[PDB]
């Protein structure tokens, strides 16, 4: 039998993947891993030099690590392997930059500002003036101060990742603008996708501001919107010279930086108190729109799986394992969804089954199709776990197994019907069928939302109802537990990949993150995470120019 | 009255699950491990000392007159104020005779006043120390619920429920609390469940042969018996899922006509 | 009675209505009209049926620029309107002799629903109105048009909009005068949420009625915040009576005396009236002249200064016919008064501080919005306890269409819904009548 | 009127009270006792006079581990408790005969103040009681002991902790059953923010009364959240009647039938009773002989299952006399019931998921704690709409003292103050009495 | 442009003080475990390894690079002089040595015979995430070090007691949360 995960299992395990027996306690403990030995040498040097003898890393306390063979990790659709320690979000600069690029993005529409300038303020607005404003904001956004040498400014090399870009659904205005700082929809998207996005956007103009990464590092995510608004206001009153009063300037300020602002995430209430642009406020549709694989790939499964990988790396690793828990983290659970082609194999089987039985989008969402597709995919995944002991050793935790099988089932249902809530219903049916099959599930509180899910998937009550695109980490059922949210984002994307949609929830977010100037290229999140795990990713936010060399 | 049916299905695994759930079903006795050995394997207390107490005996303390509380007879360990301790197991996925959710359901349908929790890697019971020791030795240890090779009592560093067995058909254990002895074929426990070494290793007996394990396991496997071979369980699961979805949408009899 | 203060009530035309009215007859804790307005504000919800139809037809669910392809429902909400209204009323109905008003607005494109008080007597807050109306609307829409089971989430998103994820009603088509209690500036700040433009639109750009509306809301809120308790109750009662309800006709008298005047002349008339009424006396005459003044009645002096502040705003903004002068007028009215008499200004400098807030909020590139969107539930405008907001209502009533944030732009639906109630359209007249109905109980 | 199903009424001892009572008689929208409880819970405030005296004597203002040296006041609040209470009553009284009361608790060591309802009619929310009581206390303390003008700030910090800086009363000595509106996790969650320990301490550790209190609060909250409107109202009415007031004596019957039983025996009893009453019927007989059941009455089956869940929690946590089994019992009652009958759980799996999260956060490192610190507002236990918290209250009542975060540790002031009112202490009998009063009106 | 101001804010942000007295009482009265200065020394050794991101239980974990967490310390101070005497001076913040005699006496009188733990999570954590991460990070690592230093079950009711104590009962935050309009 041919399986997509077979090659990784051959590389990871020395014995046959179908072999049921092995031997342990013969690997030397933590010495079997190069990463652990490098950590030990570092810890010794740091302790002696910087810590003045206070111990930092003591492998001799706690569990004796490495009693079993510490496996390496492939990355799905990439031919490069890495240790599990390289995929920790703190040890991986690619994941950190993935969160940085999302955190430091604000989209502001500039059509009310132009209309207020033309009519109320009596100032003409032309493509030349728009180009002048773009020059001004590009100088001023990172740290600049326009024609004021006496004003303190940020070191330019400290904010090399800061850009201000413009895009518009108006073709003539788009080709009249400078290409230095324009996000061209026509040349970044295929023809049909570009037409759909232009129709959805309209004939309006939007500017994207990428606040420097260092600002989000020092401060929180709620700083980004204020920084963008202040710099936009300064650039607008500097580029266009206006002789109107100060009250008209207040109306213009509202129109320019408080009217058509689009944020990545919302603020969270209660014990999740957080500002905007934090990973807990990003809806699943927004994250699907952030990932740009619909641009470069026509495969629906690949499009859903890239969103799954990005959502795992964000929600499970950064958001949950640091923002909400902290410590070593929940890297395990997230890597399980994008390391080997296990989820790829399961999702490809689900797509093949749906195509053979119901057609690509050949059925309306009914209960029967949800039940049969989810049951078939879950049974296939569980028997795949059963007959490949190396696979079960690779996904040693019950949660990582449950999430992968349920994600495959939900993606299959979304393929069949094109409805995201039907896909999440299939996910929940898969979860309970998994529980009855293996007499097992995830950890202690893994299935809080999986027992509550079936009833909340198609609910119409106030705190229970929402389209899966409009759900997110602040959805009450999804608030706490790991191993769900990235797969939920993948299912939400798969609801639209079946229809061949150009976007899922927000066209502006899609166009904004199509920008080539981003440090993290969202066209291939898995490849970039692989690059970061190899210490070959150039991240921003480093204060190298304001620190001593010694 | 109503005669319970516990689980659906007609396969062997379904029947074993029904037997585990059934409180009137007598679990087959396989071993004889004395109470002192079990107590010292758990590692909470040394056999010989009095039970530690978390609150005074219920007779000494005074309570408000609660009619609905005083008509439930308490456990003997509860009226003695004994502290609440735990016993935890890891069940291998290769035909272990008892499984986490199966264990939790059987314990909650067989024992009185116990707290059962289930994960993939472990299953834990918490009860008053005297009652915990009594039911542990009588049910959990010397019955078909325990296999010294595929199930081990572990309080921490639980890892190996999903790993391949070693050359002796024995589960992986980082702390190596139990050891297989080749010159007898018996399994000996050299540490307590947390990991503190014991003064003298305690013999728990021979492992169950694999052929017997096949017909007493409660797990569905593509090689032992598949869930595809028991359509009734899948149908019941799908019915429960549909009922949940319909009740979540609109909880009326008219909505449930589409059940 | 505990206050010996008496007031004479004048209508909006400057005519005497009644004399020797007890000061507590206008108290929020006694006045029936203020109670009725608070209840109606709590239980009234406005539904935008045309917005729901447009959002569902285009799949425009989400906050801003958001749109979900494939989740579009084509229903004729405005075309029916009445089956929907009847179903919503039937769902929300508690008893037979029950309020439950659902009324058609603008020929079917809007609904004005009044949730029964029975559902609010067993609620700890006012949020039950919007939630109950949203649920009833969802059920009515799902039942009237046979919506599939897999589109109820779309209907919910069209009605409420992002609520479980985003804890408010952002992209929804249901609205109320009060915001979410989790989004307040402080505890008890719920009633200071109605902006100036809403007050002006509800009263149909009548200066005295808009002033009365804003003052009633602000002082009732101060009673709710625990501020008007004990020694501060008299000051807030006098502030309400003299700044909002035109007690003793002070506001009209000052405006008439300064028809061709400036802010300085208004200050002069205020000081003259305070001296003539015995409110302030001469403390001492310094070496360089300048007889200092001390208040013989601290609370009454604060009330006189507040009435003069409203009159000064009216005079200046009626001279300019523009509503952009409010911040400067309040700031420098207080400044001139303080350094003219040696007396404290309105609210002991809090009015001046809030006026500085108005100035930097509406007069720069770091400004945001105009005076029409001022309310007490903002970090910039919360500092005065109901003494700086009511004059802004006069300012915006005097504006001759030179504002971007005009009431017509921002409060059309609010005016259409709440102008039907008599106590909201003419707060001054009906508050006066309610005070007259309880004259003898004190 | 619109519901044709009747219920019987049994007291906490299992004795019959009345038969053929309409389901709506216990509705929050009709039952006078539930309305009275909601009204009184919004206006009752607990005052820790001894805490105030201790905080001022040592300068312990500012919250956890915080002292401000130099800001120390030596007052005798507990000795002058009667004078302080009289002054607070004078300040808060509206006219002469309102429902303003300040009773002395523990020999002046605590105060139980009830702000008048007239002060809450014109308030949008419930925060007016705490703020008004704080201001009245500040004035009474300043005027009884002639506290210097430069120490009123210290007094304020003693009464409310860091309120302007921290939107809460954390380090203060004033408390209420309901939390601050800034702590709500969703709209309409005000009545869900009562922790289990508060409910147990208020009812003086009486199992049936604690169940009644928690169930009444949770179902009234579901009414407030808009969840129990339209076609969802009957489900919550039956859930309140059966799980919370043991309508047909179901809870006591199941507990009696399983005095020395396990959870599985309770499940068997529940299924047998449901079959006998005709609530569930055999849908089909499968090939393996499994009898799949379907509900003849969906909401009645839900109510029966919820009553059985309460009985199972009582049986298990009374056998163990420890309140740490609650989450496991709630999980596995539903888990065994579903696969024994083929029927959905208590809340279509929503109570099972709440039990799963409860087990997680009550047995791990990631948060939570003892069962007594959870509430319907908690992020872990907000998911079941009033079907999971009453069992937790029953279990904490059955506890014998194995929990450190017991009601005594957590709710000492709140419990002692709120136990003095018969309506809060024995909600079951008074709710039954109110239902009997309105029996004939349907 | 000034790394010193950034480090000032980082050091303030990443500091959480936890009172390790309720946890000791749980270990003594519920789990029947005896707490002695030797056990506290062992616990400090454990947490100084666990707080930066080392593994103590759950075989097969990944760990954060020690080079990125060289500023991560878990320190202990106590107003009890007898307990402070037989404590490892490596992990001890000595009030007597760092403060003059009168100031040391005043601080000890205010603190009392109580033991506190100061956790300084790495600055990289507060730079990648926000400031609300710090208390949760410290609480998870404190719970892990407690269950691995005293050889307890990895997850029971007493574990929830530890978690609640370290999450809110005995925790000291540098700054309170600002929910609502402020949104932080
Ligand atoms: C002590 C706990 C209680 C708790 O709150 N978390 C623990 C431990 C914690 C620590 C591990 C500390 C360390 O490295 O020593 C952290 C990293 C959380 C944190 N930020 O501190 C973690 N687990 Ni857990 N935890 C995991 C997992 C698991 C799976 C292990 C499966 C199995 O083989 O039995 C089981 C759940 C189960 O009940 O099945 C599990 C349990 C447990 N997990 C149990 C008991 C562990 C035991 O072996 O004694 N983790 C996994 O399934 C893989 C992912 C992994 C997480 C780290 C990563 O992603 O690399 C880690 C995540
Ligand atoms: C429940 C609640 O914990 P508290 O008891 O409120 O402290 C909540 N924790 C979490 O959400 C933990 C989520 C991450 C760890 C668990 C992932 S399975 C929080 O921090 O606000
Ligand atoms: O096993 S627990 O549910 O405690 C947490 C898993 S990391």
Author numbering:
A (entry chain C): 4 to 553
B (entry chain A): 2 to 260
C (entry chain E), D (entry chain D): 2 to 443
E (entry chain F): 94 to 277
Tell me, in the authors' exact words, what the paper reports.
Our analysis revealed two different assembly intermediates from the ‘as isolated’ dataset. One map harbours the full activation complex, including the A2 component (58% of particles) at a resolution of 2.5 Å, whereas the second map represents an assembly lacking the A2 subunit (42% of particles), refined to a resolution of 2.7 Å. When compared to the structure without the A2 component, no significant differences were found in the active site or wedging loop of McrC. However, in the absence of A2, the N-terminal helix of McrA became completely diffusive. Altogether, this unique ATPase may not only stabilize the opening latch of McrA but also facilitates ATP-dependent collective motions in the activation complex subunits.
The enzyme responsible for CH4 formation is methyl-coenzyme M reductase (MCR). MCR enzymatically reduces methyl-coenzyme M (CH3–S–CoM) to CH4, with coenzyme B (CoB–SH) as the electron donor for the concomitant formation of CoMS–SCoB heterodisulfide. McrC, a small subunit encoded in the mcr operon, co-purifies with the methanogenic marker proteins Mmp7, Mmp17, Mmp3 and the A2 component.
